[PDB]
Structure 1
Amino acid sequence: SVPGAPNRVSFAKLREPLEVPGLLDVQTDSFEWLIGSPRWRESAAERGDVNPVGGLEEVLYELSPIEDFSGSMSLSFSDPRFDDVKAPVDECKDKDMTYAAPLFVTAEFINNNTGEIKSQTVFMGDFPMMTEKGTFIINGTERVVVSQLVRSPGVYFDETIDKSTDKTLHSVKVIPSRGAWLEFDVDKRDTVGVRIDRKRRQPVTVLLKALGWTSEQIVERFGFSEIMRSTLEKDNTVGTDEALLDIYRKLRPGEPPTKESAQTLLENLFFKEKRYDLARVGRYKVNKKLGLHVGEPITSSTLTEEDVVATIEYLVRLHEGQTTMTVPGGVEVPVETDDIDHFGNRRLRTVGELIQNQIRVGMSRMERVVRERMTTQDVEAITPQTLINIRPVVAAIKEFFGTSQLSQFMDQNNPLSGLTHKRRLSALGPGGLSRERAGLEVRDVHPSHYGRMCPIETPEGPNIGLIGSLSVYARVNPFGFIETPYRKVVDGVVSDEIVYLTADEEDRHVVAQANSPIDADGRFVEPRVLVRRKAGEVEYVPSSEVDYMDVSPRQMVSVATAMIPFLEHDDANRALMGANMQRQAVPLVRSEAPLVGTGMELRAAIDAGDVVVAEESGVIEEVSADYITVMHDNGTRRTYRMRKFARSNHGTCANQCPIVDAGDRVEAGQVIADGPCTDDGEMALGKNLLVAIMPWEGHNYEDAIILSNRLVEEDVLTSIHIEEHEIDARDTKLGAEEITRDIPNISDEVLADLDERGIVRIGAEVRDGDILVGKVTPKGETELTPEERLLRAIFGEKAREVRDTSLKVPHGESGKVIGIRVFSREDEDELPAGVNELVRVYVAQKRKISDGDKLAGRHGNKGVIGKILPVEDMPFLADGTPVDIILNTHGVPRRMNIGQILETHLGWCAHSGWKVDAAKGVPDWAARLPDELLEAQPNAIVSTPVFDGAQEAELQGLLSCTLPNRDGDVLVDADGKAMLFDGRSGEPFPYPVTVGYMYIMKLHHLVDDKIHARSTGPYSMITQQPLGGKAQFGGQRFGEMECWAMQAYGAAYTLQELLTIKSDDTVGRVKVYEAIVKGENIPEPGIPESFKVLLKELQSLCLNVEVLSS
């Protein structure tokens, strides 16, 4: 598939019809639609060339034409066009300027009376653009717009049961985009009733007479049910004008009722696009549900009285218990209640949709200012350039791409983390469910999620269910719904035609399962083929005449979950944790492709975008550690420049190194330089370690891990961490801050490394507390104490009148100094207002694995490192090879992630190599093994795809034949367990031990970032109780639960000490410090400062609180 790839042999018994799609398409295709690029134009024309209109073109078309109140003149917009980006991607990321392109739109002003047209490009602003990797660059930072899951606008029918009567009562909710809700609810009393804009109910006949229906017409249409006749009888409203009067008196009370503002009231509320835009998706959903305008294209999303009438008729028919209705002039549709969580009702607002909505808000604001100024515009003196104000639009875009919750800080711990930050569907944000208001029924898994959203990959905190990951093969409908591919099986004959069905269409079809054996004639080789049906119920099957079949296994899993071998042997909890923990692995220095992996490793690495791929075929002309120049087949040559030791958003390393020689011919799309967590182009998040699964001396107790010292000697679990420190000399009242090596009062030792110009030199090792940037801000005249003046005279110095505010290596940090980036106003570099210089120093440290660091496999088998043993007191096989890691056997059986053990066994086999003895045919357990897997050379990488893989029998067999290491000696019996020698005692352990090779990752929860301590430091502003956080010098919160625990202990003195002198009392604090430093007794504690703050707050609430002495 990919031109140059490692030959990872697979245990897969099923061929895949569809190749995995362009995993990043979710973002790039949506943005291309928004822009209206030629690529999107062609893609849409292939599939609906009737009306290809981009997002910006759509916004402009909806906005234009505009006219004033009189309509003497009008303005219009057309032909949006983008100029070339301002600066290249890397330079934009470097100098902190947004990666954007100018946007030009041709305006047109027509004075309807005089008859003049004036057109000119208007420069709507600097539109941020999406990098080819599917991500935005804003203020130098890397950001991702995550798709949002929202309730699709339309008509939703619900039914409930009332306790007071135990009767099934139905309801409808026409949910628009920025409209007014109309909930035709049916109460226990047999009378339908409207509730306009959530206002005190109505009889529906009142609205119908407000729409101008006659009671004869009302019984002509909604006459079949008794509920309707009952409503007409008990309504008591006689006349159209009576209904309109009552409706106006109820909707907008306090103003004098009329006839004009009674009619145009409703007409504007519902049937004018000014206030009730349903949007294209909303109108399409209403039409499909009610079967009104199925044939016609979509336009004028606003409603019609026909729609409301059909909604009422549908609700009443549903209450009666009908099955289908045929609206006059409309195709018949089935009467049934709607499910809000069904993926036929949850639509995706992709990046394009969100950006378009923000453009729409900005354009509405610009439209309003245009209209407001138009009154004060001198006729014939105005042109669109001087009539259009772009500031609201650019302001809206800028406030979206920054501080909008769906514009998230790109998560780059590794290529997989970035890839899965894309393809992420979050059910919360602007116009979406909030964690608090989100119920418990939206977080669950729905049958419609199969193939459209991963049921496994999901946050495990207070976000489970609200955030998910798009499946591998899932695609987004032009309308925002999520489609999934299926093989059309015709007359029991499976085919290759891949139809992309949304959830609704899937429900109407009896869809089969991927692993249904096929007779090789296209037809099912058995009756009783497993299937799913409309209600989401998996049950028995009608043999033959199944309309669709799954494209392939793993259709339901996402990219992260598709990289867990033996997923089917792991409980959903452990699989979920493994998926969420693959994204936390730090990039190691080396990276090794797993012995046991899947088919998703290579594609994930390629599509993540952090691995260099040749654009076009050619012969590598010259390769070096910093760039690769390749000569193409026709004259031209191209140079790819690697990104060496760059810092990612999360502090990790982003090193890229070539993997091609100086003469190799490379085809288009071939990997030519692996990325951070990549090995020969395939993803590599961790290392393969020789593992024993025994309990060892209580050091691997409760999910703790004991590692050999080899892993620290050979430096296999080690990560480069780059940390950036920023400091900017500003303009202050007393003057300006200088960056130089003249820091006041500090000696010539700690001013040693600092360059001639201040900032420290490159390659200068710095430990916590050292000076990076020597800065000196002015102090202004103050009052030196008599003691200090005397001391200065004795030691002959001067006040210097300038304080120090130097940048220093914050506490607990260390490392070399990669490079310094200096921006300066004097050299005319863009900097914020009132700053002269801004210097950033990059400090890199090579972290080695040490106890407290968090490790994990791919099966949710996490754990911190309890101990790092010397290699000599490490269990070693009979051969003499020490084991690298020791997990505990007490964590496997009950957490139900036996898959890891399977992986272990397979890993060992892959490490040793095997030969199935096919002397007399193939063994019965190897009959269905793919050819060429009968023989594997030692250290052979293998793949076990997610839900088709190495069956247990095949693993048993391959474990039996495990061709010997170096002499004739099989270190692992057929059971998979090896006889280990004790490192310390020297005797063999009495029983064999499960030994193998587990691929374990080093998670980004390193103890160096977790350790923190405090004795005294900053104190908060309004209250004492020092600042919290390791970032500051933070004290550990002693909450109310801890204080209750202390009260239960009966320890009154320690609790008083904690809550008074350790935290708040501002006089006993320095006193306790003095007592400790001088050896005196700790003093009596006083009144905490927070209590007096409370007393003042209460008094300022006009509450006379006084502390009576007695």
Structure 2
Amino acid sequence: NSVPGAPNRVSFAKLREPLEVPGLLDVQTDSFEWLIGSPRWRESAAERGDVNPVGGLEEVLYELSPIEDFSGSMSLSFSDPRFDDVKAPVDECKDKDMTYAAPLFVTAEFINNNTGEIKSQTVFMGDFPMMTEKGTFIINGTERVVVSQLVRSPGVYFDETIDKSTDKTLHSVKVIPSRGAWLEFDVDKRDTVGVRIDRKRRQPVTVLLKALGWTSEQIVERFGFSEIMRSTLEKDNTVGTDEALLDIYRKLRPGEPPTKESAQTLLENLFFKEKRYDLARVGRYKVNKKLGLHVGEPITSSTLTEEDVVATIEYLVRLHEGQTTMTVPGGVEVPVETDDIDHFGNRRLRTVGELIQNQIRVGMSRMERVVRERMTTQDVEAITPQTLINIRPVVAAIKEFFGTSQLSQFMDQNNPLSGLTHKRRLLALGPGGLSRERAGLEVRDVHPSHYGRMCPIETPEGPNIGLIGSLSVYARVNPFGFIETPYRKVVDGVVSDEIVYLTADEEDRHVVAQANSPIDADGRFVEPRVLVRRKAGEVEYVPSSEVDYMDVSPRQMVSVATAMIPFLEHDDANRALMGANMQRQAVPLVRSEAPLVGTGMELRAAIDAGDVVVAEESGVIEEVSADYITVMHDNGTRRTYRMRKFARSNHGTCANQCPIVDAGDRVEAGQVIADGPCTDDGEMALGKNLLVAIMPWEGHNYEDAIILSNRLVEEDVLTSIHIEEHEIDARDTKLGAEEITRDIPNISDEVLADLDERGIVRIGAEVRDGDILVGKVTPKGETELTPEERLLRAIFGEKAREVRDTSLKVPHGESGKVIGIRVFSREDEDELPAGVNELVRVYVAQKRKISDGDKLAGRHGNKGVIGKILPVEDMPFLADGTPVDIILNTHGVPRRMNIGQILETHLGWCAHSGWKVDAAKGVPDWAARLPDELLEAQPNAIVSTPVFDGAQEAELQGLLSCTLPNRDGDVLVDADGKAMLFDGRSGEPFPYPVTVGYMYIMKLHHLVDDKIHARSTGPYSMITQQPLGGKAQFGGQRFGEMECWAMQAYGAAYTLQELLTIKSDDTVGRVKVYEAIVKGENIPEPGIPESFKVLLKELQSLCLNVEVLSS
């Protein structure tokens, strides 16, 4: 069970995996606790590798401390970061739009070198944003998640290349540092090795060794075997170490004198002065592993070294020499091979702690520049650490990371699953990551070092395929950023329980077998020839002794959102991709019933998503409500879990939390106590269970279209709540200040009935499109009046009414009730921006029922819009008179290759009507492999087939023969799975039985009311006079180039002339068209578009005389 309040979901699992699913937000939480250096991280860092427990801030400060001047005569050195309490709790910050912060404090110490003093202060380093309980950040009230990023680890990357002009291998090596300088040793088309430092020219490597002062004799002694190094030894044409140093300086610098010592220090400065070259701890560990340069000494001295350079060059020449291994003098031997830049040994994961540490460090760079600009200039024995330190670049750097970066994303939540999979998500495009314009299609591809470390199914389906992935279920991140994976080691056929986490290189060291293998629960693989995974990705039947690692489970390769797909092993990977994507786009309904057929990964994925209130300590419920559960802990204390009623999510959905426990129950430590948005008794529930039929019904379910019963509309089965926010401010102007007030100029009184006495509408008023929400007027000024307007004002006695109404009107196509109005005032001492008096937000909510056009999808990528909501009478009903609910299409099933939906449908009917396999004449044959307490099941009992320990189609076939009758003696669904569907429309039975069953389908977030749009005349653009774009404004559809080619290919010249002149840019022509249409005249002749005149003025401004001529 493993969770004390779980609903009993009887599983079809035949295996028994030892490692339970981890704390799925660990990839966020443990990384951030590493950044803080909290004691909960410190004990786990004392668990292994306890010699250096250092936080993120401690590491940044230790590479910052000390900071000395140009002379070194005064040194300021930081120490000991510290955190206060948070300035405000989470819900208060989410209300008042404050960012969830906590103040830093750094014990900064200044030393004077000449006289000798300490200056120990406590510098306020800045208000620092902190991760919430659930893994997210809160920035200015909105909720933000920093998404992890894949980059290649800095190291030495040996590789070979081929040439069609040579037909020979050309090796290379790219020593990549972090923020240092690249360098390469590439064998050219001839047999010459050449140093390319900082992308300079060819420059043979014996010159570089002489720049290290290495003699030609020392090269000969080092490379006596090396033929190409010998040829470049004799072919160097420069002897004398400084004679090579000036050559290096002249190639790299040019525009500077030789001045030998300046060239002498430069090569030391460029690679070994560590304030300009820092391959990280990851870099030093990776390099020392790659060349075997270190036996057991710890990872320190993050600059480069001459021993590493000579080992690099020796490794390159032995790689070109066809060597297989190489020992280095003074280190362990290593194999000789190229390196793949897509292998997950060579691709680390810059998680959230690493990212914010990088941003803090680049803030500290400009802070240190400001310090050393300040420390030398100001007087000595007057400064203090408060004087020298300007924290403004640090706090500005963190704020410009959290706001406004391509990684700190607006946290997408319209179900708990999209939140969960929007964390733990691997991203591959950022600063220093690959852009799309430079994106190579090799990085798009999976390759067999993703097994357990990434999910090949789940990825975006647009143009960002393969870049954005997702973490696996069981994955874990090493302290260097490499991605672990748990394996059960097997010692000589005895599958142990020493669950050893393994990274990619160590996975390549050994061989790895599969969990779906015959095991007698004593180790002891029954088959000697077992499936196994070699290092390069090979699959061989190795005898069952050399197997030294087993998988922890099946479904280890898969993500979280894909592990909720039932019958995954029957789908194609494209449609499983679409199912895994569109499981993250369900909207939360108002009832949210748990699925009949599921997997094991719903309960754990909901209680780890944070959108279920979980009882912390065990006890008895003192009191329930809709707003709070006051629990009573067993030792005296009580605690109230406040609800979150009708919160608006970041994409405008429901966020209700009704309690599920009663007024006197007992709860345990970890029990689900409150079902969130998409939950039901704790487990995940994104859609409803629906009776399905797979016949093509009358052409309405044509080409992925879905028809529905009217029962879904009538019984509110599919009904989402959508909560939209509107807001307006009241800021000052040159003419005074804007005034939220009930009195609006030139307005009637029936629209001013919704408003209260001071502006805003009353809570509970149903508004339509175009109604007043906040009566707000501005001072307009004094303009001259047209004489017609003047004499009409003289006739009707109305004054000029010098204020101009620009009120907040609820825009087109939006309606519904008004939930709540939060008004912030400058007079009420709130935190408004400068010069803004009254800020007021209005939350309009509606109850979007289902309709035609709304996108629906099952859990297998079988998506489709709603074709036609039939009435409940003319819908095909069974012999029982139960009408089916939706009707799918047949031709969508086979040619898309997902009969996972058909197996889910058959198993849904079995779990719905319930079964009892008669073990009276013994247990039958298929049921023997089937576990116990599944031979009989009550109707509407939930089951669970996990992802790869699935349902076994033979056993499902045996199940469908042995289901139990509904209410009468009546078996609706035969052994094949097809019922005798009568027709609702005409009334005769359909002449062939039709597959029916129960199916899980979700309401997707692509509803029509968000998508419909129309504009006859709206706004216009500024520079060119085109109409605008997008549903937020009015905008018109982009009549692009391909539409223009289609209109030309018809030969329709006149329509193209209309579309390109008098509907966009003929600025007199627009009002002439409007006037002639309303008056009923002919459409006038078009003129010259405005965008052409703009082009003409641009070409004239580029000193091109562009005249235009008649004759």
Q: TM-score range by the shorter chain?
A: over 0.9
| Separation of aligned partners in 2, 1:1044 and 1:162 | 43
Deviation by residue 1:1045-1102 (Cα, 9 ceiling, x = unmatched) = 0000010000001100011100111000011001000000000111110000001000
Question: Secondary structure in 2 aligned to 1:130?
Answer: coil
**Preserved CA contact (<8 Å) 1:567 1:575:** yes
Question: Secondary structure in 1 aligned to 2:817?
Answer: coil
| Separation of aligned partners in 2, 1:583 and 1:769 | 33
**Structural mapping, 1:725-874, within 5 Å:** 725-874=726-875
Identity %: 100
Deviation by residue 1:32-55 (Cα, 9 ceiling, x = unmatched) = 000000100001100111111010
| Separation of aligned partners in 2, 1:857 and 1:261 | 70
| Separation of aligned partners in 1, 2:595 and 2:156 | 50
| Separation of aligned partners in 1, 2:316 and 2:922 | 68
Q: Please report how far the alpha carbon of residue 525 of structure 1 lies from its aligned counterpart in structure 2 after TM superposition.
A: 1.3
| Separation of aligned partners in 1, 2:680 and 2:691 | 20
Q: Please report how far the alpha carbon of residue 589 of structure 1 lies from its aligned counterpart in structure 2 after TM superposition.
A: 0.4
Q: With structure 1 as the length reference, what TM-score do the two structures score?
A: 1.00
Aligned equivalent of 1:893: 894
Q: Please report how far the alpha carbon of residue 245 of structure 1 lies from its aligned counterpart in structure 2 after TM superposition.
A: 1.2
| Separation of aligned partners in 1, 2:473 and 2:800 | 67
Q: Please report how far the alpha carbon of residue 300 of structure 1 lies from its aligned counterpart in structure 2 after TM superposition.
A: 1.4
Deviation by residue 1:486-528 (Cα, 9 ceiling, x = unmatched) = 0010011101110000011001111111111112212111111
| Separation of aligned partners in 2, 1:2 and 1:441 | 43
Q: Please report how far the alpha carbon of residue 262 of structure 1 lies from its aligned counterpart in structure 2 after TM superposition.
A: 1.1
| Separation of aligned partners in 2, 1:406 and 1:603 | 27
Q: Please report how far the alpha carbon of residue 273 of structure 1 lies from its aligned counterpart in structure 2 after TM superposition.
A: 0.6
Q: Please report how far the alpha carbon of residue 4 of structure 1 lies from its aligned counterpart in structure 2 after TM superposition.
A: 0.3
Deviation by residue 1:11-36 (Cα, 9 ceiling, x = unmatched) = 00000110000000000000000000
Aligned equivalent of 1:463: 464
Q: Please report how far the alpha carbon of residue 573 of structure 1 lies from its aligned counterpart in structure 2 after TM superposition.
A: 0.1
**Preserved CA contact (<8 Å) 2:1026 2:1065:** yes
Q: Please report how far the alpha carbon of residue 193 of structure 1 lies from its aligned counterpart in structure 2 after TM superposition.
A: 0.8
| Separation of aligned partners in 2, 1:540 and 1:464 | 33
Q: How many residues align?
A: 1110
Q: Please report how far the alpha carbon of residue 66 of structure 1 lies from its aligned counterpart in structure 2 after TM superposition.
A: 1.0
Question: Secondary structure in 1 aligned to 2:822?
Answer: strand
| Separation of aligned partners in 2, 1:574 and 1:613 | 35
**Preserved CA contact (<8 Å) 1:288 1:294:** no
**Preserved CA contact (<8 Å) 1:618 1:666:** yes
Q: Please report how far the alpha carbon of residue 1109 of structure 1 lies from its aligned counterpart in structure 2 after TM superposition.
A: 1.1
Q: Please report how far the alpha carbon of residue 386 of structure 1 lies from its aligned counterpart in structure 2 after TM superposition.
A: 1.2
Q: Please report how far the alpha carbon of residue 223 of structure 1 lies from its aligned counterpart in structure 2 after TM superposition.
A: 2.2
| Separation of aligned partners in 1, 2:871 and 2:937 | 33
| Separation of aligned partners in 1, 2:750 and 2:261 | 87
**Structural mapping, 1:238-277, within 5 Å:** 238-277=239-278
Question: Secondary structure in 1 aligned to 2:156?
Answer: strand
**Preserved CA contact (<8 Å) 2:525 2:544:** no
Question: Secondary structure in 2 aligned to 1:343?
Answer: coil
**Preserved CA contact (<8 Å) 1:770 1:809:** yes
Q: Please report how far the alpha carbon of residue 837 of structure 1 lies from its aligned counterpart in structure 2 after TM superposition.
A: 0.5
| Separation of aligned partners in 2, 1:868 and 1:793 | 57
Question: Secondary structure in 2 aligned to 1:1070?
Answer: helix
Q: Unaligned regions of 5+ residues in structure 1, if any?
A: none
**Preserved CA contact (<8 Å) 2:876 2:981:** yes
| Separation of aligned partners in 1, 2:364 and 2:1050 | 64
Deviation by residue 1:426-461 (Cα, 9 ceiling, x = unmatched) = 011111011110100000011000000000000000
Q: Please report how far the alpha carbon of residue 531 of structure 1 lies from its aligned counterpart in structure 2 after TM superposition.
A: 0.3
Q: Please report how far the alpha carbon of residue 382 of structure 1 lies from its aligned counterpart in structure 2 after TM superposition.
A: 0.8
**Preserved CA contact (<8 Å) 1:778 1:802:** yes
Question: Secondary structure in 1 aligned to 2:997?
Answer: strand
Question: Secondary structure in 2 aligned to 1:235?
Answer: coil
**Preserved CA contact (<8 Å) 1:628 1:639:** yes
Between 1:1067-1076 and 1:293-302, the stretch displaced more is 293-302
**Preserved CA contact (<8 Å) 1:192 1:203:** yes
| Separation of aligned partners in 1, 2:557 and 2:102 | 38
Question: Secondary structure in 1 aligned to 2:929?
Answer: coil
Q: Please report how far the alpha carbon of residue 649 of structure 1 lies from its aligned counterpart in structure 2 after TM superposition.
A: 0.3
**Structural mapping, 1:215-364, within 5 Å:** 215-364=216-365
| Separation of aligned partners in 2, 1:146 and 1:604 | 19
Q: Please report how far the alpha carbon of residue 222 of structure 1 lies from its aligned counterpart in structure 2 after TM superposition.
A: 2.0
| Separation of aligned partners in 2, 1:923 and 1:842 | 60
| Separation of aligned partners in 1, 2:538 and 2:1108 | 68
| Separation of aligned partners in 1, 2:218 and 2:573 | 58
Q: Please report how far the alpha carbon of residue 805 of structure 1 lies from its aligned counterpart in structure 2 after TM superposition.
A: 1.1
| Separation of aligned partners in 1, 2:574 and 2:121 | 60
Q: Work out whether 1:431 is the aligned partner of 2:432.
A: yes
Deviation by residue 1:794-816 (Cα, 9 ceiling, x = unmatched) = 01111111101100111110010
Question: Secondary structure in 1 aligned to 2:623?
Answer: strand
| Separation of aligned partners in 1, 2:1100 and 2:437 | 34
| Separation of aligned partners in 1, 2:841 and 2:887 | 42
Q: Please report how far the alpha carbon of residue 108 of structure 1 lies from its aligned counterpart in structure 2 after TM superposition.
A: 0.4
**Preserved CA contact (<8 Å) 2:624 2:659:** yes
Q: Please report how far the alpha carbon of residue 139 of structure 1 lies from its aligned counterpart in structure 2 after TM superposition.
A: 0.5
Q: Please report how far the alpha carbon of residue 294 of structure 1 lies from its aligned counterpart in structure 2 after TM superposition.
A: 3.5
Deviation by residue 1:520-558 (Cα, 9 ceiling, x = unmatched) = 212111111110011112233243221101000010001
Q: Please report how far the alpha carbon of residue 760 of structure 1 lies from its aligned counterpart in structure 2 after TM superposition.
A: 0.6
**Preserved CA contact (<8 Å) 1:414 1:587:** yes
| Separation of aligned partners in 2, 1:1095 and 1:664 | 79
Deviation by residue 1:195-223 (Cα, 9 ceiling, x = unmatched) = 01000121100000100101111011122
**Preserved CA contact (<8 Å) 1:631 1:638:** yes
Q: Please report how far the alpha carbon of residue 779 of structure 1 lies from its aligned counterpart in structure 2 after TM superposition.
A: 0.4
| Separation of aligned partners in 2, 1:338 and 1:799 | 79
| Separation of aligned partners in 2, 1:1064 and 1:922 | 80
**Preserved CA contact (<8 Å) 1:110 1:116:** yes
| Separation of aligned partners in 2, 1:566 and 1:361 | 48
| Separation of aligned partners in 1, 2:113 and 2:233 | 49
Q: Please report how far the alpha carbon of residue 759 of structure 1 lies from its aligned counterpart in structure 2 after TM superposition.
A: 0.6
Between 1:515-524 and 1:907-916, the stretch displaced more is 515-524
Aligned equivalent of 1:675: 676
| Separation of aligned partners in 2, 1:38 and 1:1040 | 61
| Separation of aligned partners in 1, 2:651 and 2:166 | 59
Deviation by residue 1:48-78 (Cα, 9 ceiling, x = unmatched) = 1111101011001110011111111101111
Question: Secondary structure in 2 aligned to 1:469?
Answer: coil
**Preserved CA contact (<8 Å) 1:762 1:818:** yes
| Separation of aligned partners in 1, 2:225 and 2:1008 | 73
Deviation by residue 1:894-953 (Cα, 9 ceiling, x = unmatched) = 000100000000000000000011112211111110110101100000001000111001
| Separation of aligned partners in 2, 1:260 and 1:774 | 76
Give the RMSD, CA atoms, in angstroms. Answer: 0.6
**Preserved CA contact (<8 Å) 1:631 1:637:** yes
| Separation of aligned partners in 2, 1:877 and 1:657 | 36
| Separation of aligned partners in 2, 1:610 and 1:773 | 33
**Preserved CA contact (<8 Å) 1:979 1:993:** yes
Deviation by residue 1:845-871 (Cα, 9 ceiling, x = unmatched) = 000000000000000000000100000
Q: With structure 2 as the length reference, what TM-score do the two structures score?
A: 1.00
**Preserved CA contact (<8 Å) 1:105 1:122:** yes
| Separation of aligned partners in 1, 2:169 and 2:1014 | 62
Q: Please report how far the alpha carbon of residue 242 of structure 1 lies from its aligned counterpart in structure 2 after TM superposition.
A: 1.2
* Structure 1 segments (4+ residues) deviating >6 Å: none
Question: Secondary structure in 1 aligned to 2:703?
Answer: coil
| Separation of aligned partners in 1, 2:376 and 2:492 | 69
Q: Please report how far the alpha carbon of residue 844 of structure 1 lies from its aligned counterpart in structure 2 after TM superposition.
A: 0.4
Aligned equivalent of 1:74: 75
**Preserved CA contact (<8 Å) 1:705 1:863:** yes
| Separation of aligned partners in 1, 2:998 and 2:626 | 32
| Separation of aligned partners in 1, 2:713 and 2:1008 | 16
| Separation of aligned partners in 2, 1:684 and 1:317 | 59
| Separation of aligned partners in 2, 1:1036 and 1:945 | 46
